[PDB]
C-alpha cells in the first residue's frame, strides 16, 4: 500500500500530514526486437 | 571586517601528475572536473573583486580634501593621508598596514584587480566627502558644510540639539581628538587587536599548506612520487597504482575548492556587510541603534586593510 | 505637483527603453539559470567519463567481462558517479544558501520600501528614498525604486547662529542661509528662503560662546499686532 | 609588443598614459580596452578628481531636483531538481541496479537534501 | 512501434519506445545523438527509415497522506506523468 | 521577454505559478 511504503520511508508506523516522494515509477518493456541488415551472402560451401 | 580572500589557482596537471606525461594522459579519462575546479576557482576570483568594488567603490568620483585641513577644532590627520610616504596613506593605515602579517607546483596567488594605492584613493576619497560634505555625497551631488554644521546635524540626529554642539565646541572637538589619538596606542600596544583580519589569511595560508602537504600521503599506494611508480611498474599494473593517487588527489582538490566557496560564502556575507556600513554609517548616519558601533551613533570613518576594512566608529 | 508627476511618469517611460537597449540589464537572474543549467549539462557529461574504467557504458562491460573481472569496472564506474552527483548536491546546497540570503534580502526591501519607506542610505536605490515597485521576474523580482536627488546646487554663505538682543538663536530646521545680503532660513533639501523670526528660532545662552555667530533681525509677529 | 605587470607579461597591447574607465580587468590596476584599430592597455581611472570647495562659511544648497527611478534585481528561487539515483547511475539496468542496493543510504541523503532545497525555494 | 521494448539496431543495445521522424539523416550517417550524447535517433538497417529512441515513461511517485492519526486515505501523485498512460 | 532559458534528471514546477506571483 502507498501508505505502508511512505511508513517504510519515514521508518515509522505513523505518518504526519505532507506530501512525501516515497519512490520512482517506470514502465517495463513489453518485449524485444532485433533489427539487422540484408545479410544474405552465404557462403560457397553450398555450392562447393 | 575581512571584505576579501587572496585569489587563488590551482593547475591541475602540475598538481596531480607534476612533470609526469603518462599521468596527464590518463587525467584526462576523468571528465571535466579540472574544468569545475578552475571555474569555481575564477568565480570566487572574480567576486573577490565584486567585494572589493561593492565596499571601496561607493562613491563614483574621488574627493580631495582642501589644503586647508582645519575642521573647526576637528583633527583628521591621523586618518587623512600622508604624502610623505611612497604609497599616501594615513598614520592609523600605516600601523593597519604593518600589524597584519602577511608557483609552488601548481599552487599560485594571484593579484587583486584594486591596488592598495588605489583602495587608499578610494578611502580618501570617502573620506574627503564625508568630511566636506557629511551625507549629501551619498545621495546624490556632493555639497560642501563646515564640519561644525555637519556635527549639529547629527547631534539632531540623536536627539540632542544643535546649541549642544555649538555652546561646547572646543570640548567635544578635544574629545575627538583624544579618541582619535588613542586609536594607534591601543593597536600597537594590543597586538592582537587585527585578529579579525589576520584569521582569513592563516587560514589561506593553512589551507594551501594543507594541500600541498598531502602529496606525501600514498593514498594507500606504494609510493607518493609518480616518477617511481612509473619507473618500477610496467603500464599494466602501474595504471591502478596511478587511479589510485589521481583519485586521491582529485578528492583532495574537490575538498580544497568546496571548503573555499564555503569560506567565500562567509567572505561575501562580511563584504555585503562592510558595503551596509559604509552605506549607512558614513554617507549617512544610522538610527539602527547597535549597527554603528556601541552607543548612538554620531558618524564612522573606514580605513583599508589587507583583505578587509577598519571602522573608526 | 505637475512638474512632479510628469518626471514621474517619463522616468517610468524611460524604463522601459533601459531594459529594452541594456544588453544584460537582468543579468543577475540569467546568471542563476545559466548556473543551473552548466551544472546539469556537466553532470550529465560526467556520465560519458570512463573514470577509468575500460568503457562509460554499462552494457559493454556487462558484455566482454566476466562478472567476477566487471565487478570492479562496475564499482569503479559506481563510486564516480556517486561522487559526481555528491558534488552536483553540494553546489546545489552553496547556491542555495546564496538565494537564500538573496531571498532574504529580497523580502527585506519589499518590506522596507514597498511596504513602507526606509531612511537607510543606498538601500532601497542610490539617493534619497520615496518608495519602490516591485515586478515578478521568472526566477527573482525586480524593484522600480523612486529616489530623490539634489540638483541645481547654488553657494551660499553661512553662520551656526544669528544673534540678537545679546542672545544667540538657532534654527529649528535647517540651515542659516544668505545670499551676501539677507540672512534666511533654509530646509536642507530644497532652497525654501524663510524670513527670520521666534517661530523658527530658539534661544540658547549668551552670543560669545559660539564661534562664527552673526548679527541680523529676528523679528517678533506679535509687535505689528501691538494687542 | 611586450609589457611587463605584477599578474605578468602581456603580449599584444600598447600601454598608455591615459587613464579610462577600464572593460577588461588583467590586474594590478592594469586593465585593456579597444582603442578605436588595436589592443590598449592603461592604469585604471577611478573617476573624476573633485576638490570639492570646502571652508568654514560657504554652504551649497540645492535650489532644484530629480526623482529619478532605478531597477534594482535580486534572485528570489532557483529551479527544483530531482534526481533518480538509479537512472543516472547506470541507466535502469537490473545487473547494475542489484549491485547499487550495497551502497546503502546515499540515495536518502542526497534525495532529502534536494527536497528541503526544493522547499526552501517555495 | 510506439510501444516500450527492448531493441537492438545492428548492436546500440538499449531499450525505449519507436516512433517515426522527420530528422533526415544523410546518407552516411546510421545513428543520432542529441545534446550530452543520448541515442535520439537511429535509421533501421534493412527499410532504412528513420526513428526516434524515446525512453520509456519514469517519474516518481509521492503519496498525500491527511495524517495517519486522521485517517488511512491516501492519493498518489505520479510527477511527470500523464494520465492518458499509468 | 529579456531572459529565456531524460537521464534521470527532472525539473518539479513551483507552487506558486507565474499567475499568482503576478
Ligand atoms: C564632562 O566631561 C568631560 C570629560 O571628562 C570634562 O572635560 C574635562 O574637564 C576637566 C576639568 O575641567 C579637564 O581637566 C579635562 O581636560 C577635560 N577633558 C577634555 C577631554 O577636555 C567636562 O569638564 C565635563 N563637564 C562637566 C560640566 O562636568
Ligand atoms: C592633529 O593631531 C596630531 C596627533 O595628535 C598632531 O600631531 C597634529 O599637530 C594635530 N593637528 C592639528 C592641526 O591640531
Ligand atoms: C562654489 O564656488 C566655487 C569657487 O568658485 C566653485 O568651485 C563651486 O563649484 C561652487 N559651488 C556651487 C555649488 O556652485
Ligand atoms: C538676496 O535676496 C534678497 C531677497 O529679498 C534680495 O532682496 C537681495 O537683493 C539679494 N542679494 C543678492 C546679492 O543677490
Ligand atoms: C553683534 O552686536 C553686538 C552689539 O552691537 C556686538 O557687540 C557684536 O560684535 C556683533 N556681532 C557681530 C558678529 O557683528
Ligand atoms: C608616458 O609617460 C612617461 C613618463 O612621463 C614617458 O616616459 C612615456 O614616454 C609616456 N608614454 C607616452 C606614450 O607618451
Ligand atoms: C575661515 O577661513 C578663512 C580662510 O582660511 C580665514 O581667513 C578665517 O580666519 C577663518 N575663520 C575664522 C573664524 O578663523
Ligand atoms: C532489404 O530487403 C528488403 C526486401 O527485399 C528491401 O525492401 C530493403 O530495401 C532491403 N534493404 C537494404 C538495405 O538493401
Ligand atoms: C492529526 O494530527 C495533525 C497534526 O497534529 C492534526 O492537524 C490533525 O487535526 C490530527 N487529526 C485528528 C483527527 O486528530
Ligand atoms: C496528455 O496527453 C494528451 C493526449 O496526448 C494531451 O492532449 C494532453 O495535452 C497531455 N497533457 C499534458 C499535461 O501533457
Not at chain 3, 68 to 73: K, T, W
Not at chain 4, 88 to 107: A, H, K, R, V, W
Request: charged share 15%; hydrophobic share 35%.
Amino acid at each position: 500500500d502507498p501508505l505502508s511504503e511512505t511508513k517504510c520511508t519515514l521508518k515509522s508506523f505513523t505518518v504526519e500530514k505532507g506530501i512525501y516522494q516515497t519512490s520512482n515509477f517506470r514502465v517495463q518493456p513489453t518485449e524485444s526486437i532485433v533489427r539487422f541488415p540484408n545479410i544474405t551472402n552465404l557462403c560457397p560451401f553450398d555450392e562447393v | 571586517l575581512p571584505v576579501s580572500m587572496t585569489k587563488t589557482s590551482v593547475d591541475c596537471t602540475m598538481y596531480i601528475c607534476g612533470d609526469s606525461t603518462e599521468c596527464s594522459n590518463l587525467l584526462l579519462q576523468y571528465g571535466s572536473f579540472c574544468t569545475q575546479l578552475k571555474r569555481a576557482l575564477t568565480g570566487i576570483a572574480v567576486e573577490q573583486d565584486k567585494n572589493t568594488q561593492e565596499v571601496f567603490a561607493q562613491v563614483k568620483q574621488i574627493y580631495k580634501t582642501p589644503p586647508i585641513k582645519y575642521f573647526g577644532g576637528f583633527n583628521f590627520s591621523q586618518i587623512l593621508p600622508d604624502p610623505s610616504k611612497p604609497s599616501k596613506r594615513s598614520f592609523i593605515e600605516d600601523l593597519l598596514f604593518n600589524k597584519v602579517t602577511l608557483k609552488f607546483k601548481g599552487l599560485t596567488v594571484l593579484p587583486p584587480l584594486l591596488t592598495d594605492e588605489m583602495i587608499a584613493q578610494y578611502t580618501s576619497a570617502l573620506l574627503a566627502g564625508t568630511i566636506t560634505s557629511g551625507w549629501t555625497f551619498g545621495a546624490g551631488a556632493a555639497l560642501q558644510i563646515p564640519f561644525a554644521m555637519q556635527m549639529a546635524y547629527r547631534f539632531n540626529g540623536i536627539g540632542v540639539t544643535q546649541n549642544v554642539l555649538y555652546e561646547n565646541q572646543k570640548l567635544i572637538a578635544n574629545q575627538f581628538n583624544s579618541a582619535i589619538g588613542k586609536i594607534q596606542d591601543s593597536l600597537s600596544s594590543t597586538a592582537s587587536a587585527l585578529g579579525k583580519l589576520q584569521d582569513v589569511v592563516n587560514h589561506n595560508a593553512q589551507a594551501l599548506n594543507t594541500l600541498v602537504k598531502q602529496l606525501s600521503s600514498k593514498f594507500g599506494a606504494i609510493s607518493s612520487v609518480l616518477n617511481d611508480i612509473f619507473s618500477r611498474l610496467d603500464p599494466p599494473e602501474a595504471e591502478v597504482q596511478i587511479d589510485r593517487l589521481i583519485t586521491g588527489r582529485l578528492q583532495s582538490l574537490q575538498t580544497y575548492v568546496t571548503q573555499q566557496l564555503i569560506r567565500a560564502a562567509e567572505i561575501r556575507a562580511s563584504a555585503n556587510l562592510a558595503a551596509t556600513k559604509m552605506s549607512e554609517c558614513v554617507l549617512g548616519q544610522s538610527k539602527r541603534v547597535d549597527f554603528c558601533g556601541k552607543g548612538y551613533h554620531l558618524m564612522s570613518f573606514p580605513q583599508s586593510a589587507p583583505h578587509g576594512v577598519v571602522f573608526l566608529h | 505637483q505637475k512638474l512632479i508627476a510628469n518626471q514621474f511618469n517619463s522616468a517610468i517611460g524611460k524604463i522601459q527603453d533601459s531594459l529594452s537597449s541594456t544588453a544584460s540589464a537582468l543579468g543577475k537572474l540569467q546568471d542563476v539559470v545559466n548556473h543551473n543549467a552548466q551544472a546539469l549539462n556537466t553532470l550529465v557529461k560526467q556520465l560519458s567519463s570512463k573514470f577509468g574504467a575500460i568503457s562509460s557504458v554499462l552494457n559493454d562491460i556487462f558484455s566482454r567481462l566476466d562478472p567476477p573481472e566487471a565487478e570492479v569496472q562496475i564499482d569503479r564506474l559506481i563510486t564516480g558517479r556517486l561522487q559526481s552527483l555528491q558534488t552536483y548536491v553540494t553546489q546545489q546546497l552553496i547556491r542555495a544558501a546564496e538565494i537564500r540570503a538573496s531571498a532574504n534580502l529580497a523580502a527585506t526591501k519589499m518590506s522596507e520600501c514597498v511596504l513602507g519607506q526606509s531612511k537607510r542610505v543606498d538601500f532601497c536605490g542610490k539617493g534619497y528614498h520615496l518608495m519602490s515597485f516591485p515586478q515578478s521576474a521568472p526566477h527573482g523580482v525586480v524593484f522600480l525604486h523612486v529616489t530623490y536627488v539634489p540638483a541645481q546646487e547654488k553657494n551660499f554663505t553661512t553662520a551656526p547662529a544669528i544673534c540678537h538682543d545679546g542672545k544667540a538663536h538657532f534654527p529649528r530646521e535647517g540651515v542659516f542661509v544668505s545670499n551676501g545680503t539677507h540672512w534666511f532660513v533654509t530646509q536642507r533639501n530644497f532652497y525654501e528662503p524663510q524670513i527670520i523670526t521666534t517661530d523658527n528660532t530658539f534661544v540658547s545662552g549668551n552670543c560669545d560662546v559660539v564661534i562664527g555667530i552673526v548679527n541680523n533681525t529676528v523679528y517678533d509677529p506679535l509687535q505689528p499686532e501691538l494687542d | 609588443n611586450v609589457f611587463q605587470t605584477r599578474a605578468g607579461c602581456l603580449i599584444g597591447a600598447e600601454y598608455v598614459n591615459n587613464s579610462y574607465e577600464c572593460d577588461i580587468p588583467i590586474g594590478a590596476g592594469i586593465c585593456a580596452s579597444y582603442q578605436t584599430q588595436s589592443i590598449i592597455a592603461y592604469t585604471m581611472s577611478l573617476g573624476a578628481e573633485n576638490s570639492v570647495a570646502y571652508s568654514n562659511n560657504s554652504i551649497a544648497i540645492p535650489t532644484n531636483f530629480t526623482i529619478s527611478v532605478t531597477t534594482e534585481i535580486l534572485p528570489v528561487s532557483m529551479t527544483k531538481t530531482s534526481v533518480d539515483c538509479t537512472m543516472y547511475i547506470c541507466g535502469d539496468s537490473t545487473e547494475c541496479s542489484n549491485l547499487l542496493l550495497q551502497y546503502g543510504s546515499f540515495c536518502t541523503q542526497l534525495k532529502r537534501a534536494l527536497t528541503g532545497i526544493a522547499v526552501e525555494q517555495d | 512501434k510506439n510501444k516500450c521494448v527492448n531493441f537492438n539496431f545492428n548492436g546500440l543495445k538499449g531499450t525505449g519506445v519507436l516512433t517515426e521522424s522527420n530528422k533526415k539523416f544523410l546518407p552516411f550517417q546510421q545513428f543520432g545523438r542529441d545534446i550530452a550524447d543520448t541515442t535520439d535517433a537511429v535509421r533501421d538497417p534493412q527499410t532504412l527509415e528513420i526513428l526516434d529512441i524515446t525512453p520509456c515513461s519514469f517519474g516518481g511517485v509521492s503519496v498525500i497522506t491527511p495524517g495517519t492519526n486522521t485517517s488511512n486515505q491516501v492519493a498518489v501523485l505520479y510527477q511527470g506523468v500523464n494520465c492518458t498512460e499509468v
